[PDB]
Amino acid sequence: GAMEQSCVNCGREAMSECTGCHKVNYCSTFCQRKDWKDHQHICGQSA
């Protein structure tokens, strides 16, 4: 349910995770892709 995880861009409405790293959670692919501008330089380590 949309309680266990919280979109780093929105809130508990989170439902979808980043493929690549499982350290952060989003709500939709839109937030995933929009965060990509910062996330692309971070995504890869994953700790």
Q: Which two tokens stand for residue 39?
A: 């996330």
Q: Which of 9, 15, 16, 17 binds Zn ion (CB under 5 A)?
A: 9
**15 near Zn ion (CB under 5 A):** no
Beta strands in the chain (DSSP E): 16-17, 25-26
Q: Answer whether 36's CB lies under 8 Å from 26's CB.
A: no
Closest CA to 20 of 4, 2, 36: 36
Q: Which of 6, 15, 16, 43 binds Zn ion (CB under 5 A)?
A: 43
The binding site for Zn(2+) comprises: 7, 10, 18, 21, 27, 31, 39, 43
Residues near Zn ion (CB under 5 A) are 7, 9-10, 18, 20-21, 27, 31, 43
